Amino acid sequence: QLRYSVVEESEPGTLVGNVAQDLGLKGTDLLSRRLRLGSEENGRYFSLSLVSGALAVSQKIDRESLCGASTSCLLPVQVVTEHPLELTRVEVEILDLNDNSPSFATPDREMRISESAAPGARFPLDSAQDPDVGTNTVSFYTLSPNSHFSLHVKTLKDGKLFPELVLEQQLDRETQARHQLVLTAVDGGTPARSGTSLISVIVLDVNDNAPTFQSSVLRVGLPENTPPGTLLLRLNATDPDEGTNGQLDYSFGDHTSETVKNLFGLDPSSGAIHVLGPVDFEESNFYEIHARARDQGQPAMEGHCVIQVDV
Ligand SMILES: *[C@@H]1O[C@H](CO)[C@@H](O[C@@H]2O[C@H](CO)[C@@H](O)[C@H](O)[C@H]2NC(C)=O)[C@H](O)[C@H]1NC(C)=O
Ligand SMILES: *[C@H]1O[C@H](CO)[C@@H](O)[C@H](O)[C@@H]1O
Ligand SMILES: *[C@H]1O[C@H](CO)[C@@H](O)[C@H](O)[C@@H]1O
Ligand SMILES: [Ca+2]
Ligand SMILES: [Ca+2]
Ligand SMILES: [Ca+2]
Ligand SMILES: [Ca+2]
Ligand SMILES: [Ca+2]
Ligand SMILES: [Ca+2]
Numbered sequence: 334q335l336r337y338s339v340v341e342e343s344e345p346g347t348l349v350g351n352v353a354q355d356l357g358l359k360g361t362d363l364l365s366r367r368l369r370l371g372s373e374e375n376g377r378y379f380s381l382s383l384v385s386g387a388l389a390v391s392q393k394i395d396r397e398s399l400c401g402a403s404t405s406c407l408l409p410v411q412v413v414t415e416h417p418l419e420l421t422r423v424e425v426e427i428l429d430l431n432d433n434s435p436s437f438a439t440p441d442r443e444m445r446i447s448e449s450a451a452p453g454a455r456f457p458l459d460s461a462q463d464p465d466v467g468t469n470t471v472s473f474y475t476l477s478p479n480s481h482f483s484l485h486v487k488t489l490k491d492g493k494l495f496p497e498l499v500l501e502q503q504l505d506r507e508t509q510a511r512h513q514l515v516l517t518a519v520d521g522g523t524p525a526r527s528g529t530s531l532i533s534v535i536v537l538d539v540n541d542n543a544p545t546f547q548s549s550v551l552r553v554g555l556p557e558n559t560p561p562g563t564l565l566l567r568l569n570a571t572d573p574d575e576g577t578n579g580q581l582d583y584s585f586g587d588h589t590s591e592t593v594k595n596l597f598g599l600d601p602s603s604g605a606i607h608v609l610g611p612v613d614f615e616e617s618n619f620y621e622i623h624a625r626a627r628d629q630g631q632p633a634m635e636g637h638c639v640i641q642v643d644v
Contacts, residue, residue, distance in 0.1 A: 335412070337388060338426040341396040346389055349379065349425055352412055353386020356421065371411025371420075379410055379425065388423070396427040397464045404466065431469040431522035435461045437530040444498075444532060448506045448539040455485075456498040461518035461528055468521035477515035482534070484516075498532075506536040507573045540578035544570040544626035544636035552641035557614040559644075561607075565597070568604030570626035570636055578630040586623030593622055597642075606640075614644050 337350035353363055363386050370376040380391045388410075400406035406427040413420055438459050446456065463470040474496045476484035483499040496516070504512075512534035519527045547569045555565065572579040583604045585594065597620075598607045604626075624638035 334421050335423040336426070337423065338428055339390060339394070340428045341406075341430045342393055342432055343390055345392055349388040349390060350423075351385070351387045352381060352421075352423070356412070356414065358386060358414070366414040366416055369413040371413060373409075373411055375408055375410045378408060381412070388425070394427055396429060397433065399427065401464070402466060429466045429469055431465055431520065431526065433463055433465045433469070434526040435463045435471050435518035435520055435528040437461050437516075437518070437528055439530065441531045441533065443535060445535045445537055446500075446504065447537045448504050448541065450500055450504055452500055452503055454500045456500070458496040458498060458516060458532075459530070460494060460496060461530075463518075463520050463526075465520065465522075470520055471518050472521035472525070473519055475517045475519065477517075479512060479514055481512060482514060504536050506538050506575065507542065510536045510538075510575075512536070538575035538578060540574055540628065540630040540632065540634060542572055542574045542578075543634035544572045544581050544628055546570045546624070546626065546636060546638040548638075550639045550641065552643065555608075555612065555642055555644045557612065557644055559608060559612055561609055561611075563608060565606040565608060565642070566640070568599075568606065568624055568626070568638070570604070570638075572626075572628050574628065574630070578628055581626045581628045584625050584627060586625060589623055593620060596620075597622060612644055618644055620644075 335355055339347060339349045358366065368381060368386060370381050378391055378394055380389045382389060396406045408425045408427060410423045410425065411420060412423055442459060444456060461471050471494055474484060474486050481500060481502045481504060483501045484496065485499050486494055486496045489495055514532040516530045516532055517527055519525050553566060568583050570581055572581055582601045583599060584601060585599065596608060596610045598609050620642040622640045624640055625635055627633060627635040
């Protein structure tokens with residue numbers, strides 16, 4: 334017969350409804366007819382005033398803990414009167430308050446994306462939660478302003494939100510090896526409550542840079558009486574890649590003359606060039622040697638250089 338409503342989390346003593354008034358009871362009738370609550374468990378949440386005859390909240394009620402994700406939260410109690418005895422079914426509806434804030438699984442989420450990632454590659458994000466119902470749950474997401482990733486949220490047939498990152502511009506570890514992005518979930522409350530997640534995109538290295546010498550061609554001079562052991566020059570090639578792909582070992586061309594191979598010595602590590610044999614100006618007065626730096630990776634890459642030695 335009787336249907337009342339009360340807002341969730343309301344403090345004990347909050348009026349739910351005037352039962353006695355609705356049942357046509359007044360004054361002595363409340364004690365003559367022995368107004369009561371049923372022996373059911375739902376009497377733990379409510380109190381029926383001996384004086385007022387009004388139904389009130391007995392303890393702070395959490396509709397999240399009661400109904401969960403139900404559209405409506407009904408709490409049925411039973412009112413008992415005597416002389417004559419007659420029972421009244423009372424349904425109290427617990428209305429949803431926007432007292433829960435959007436939450437993420439982890440404050441910080443790491444995403445390891447390869448540098449070679451093609452534009453348009455989609456990267457699903459962990460969805461946020463908000464145990465409130467209606468618009469009091471997660472309404473929309475926002476992504477902090479950046480230059481490589483785009484936020485995309487689509488609504489499923491379920492109705493739940495599914496956020497994912499979209500790569501707008503191609504990454505480059507040699508520019509920045511880390512992108513920190515902030516993912517914010519916001520509910521549709523007024524005021525709106527929120528939660529964040531710090532997404533640190535770790536750009537994984539790709540061997541897309543070949544070694545490079547300081548100069549394309551470098552010419553040097555050498556006296557005709559240069560003693561063996563003297564270092565002519567030190568090769569300098571730089572690879573901006575990381576780890577193995579950035580380290581290199583020097584080498585001569587695959588078709589360097591045997592004369593230049595015996596006369597000129599090199600170091601596959603330092604790149605320093607020493608002379609071993611004799612060097613007469615009458616035999617030859619010019620040498621072009623094909624220098625070559627090669628990085629340790631798969632697929633490997635190599636840079637090339639030509640050194641002109643004048644004697
Ligand atoms: C070999 O060449 C590289 C670059 O080609 C040199 O790197 C230097 O790096 C510092 C980094 O702070 C820069 O400020 C310099 O301007 C770079 N130098 C040049 C010439 O570009 C590196 O010094 C060279 N090594 C030798 C032994 O000369
Ligand atoms: C999350 O977002 C809400 C609404 O933008 C803010 O009110 C809150 O302080 C947090 O920034
Ligand atoms: C959003 O902001 C909160 C509070 O500053 C952080 O805990 C979270 O990691 C994200 O940066
Ligand atoms: Ca609650
Ligand atoms: Ca709530
Ligand atoms: Ca909420
Ligand atoms: Ca690159
Ligand atoms: Ca790279
Ligand atoms: Ca390399």
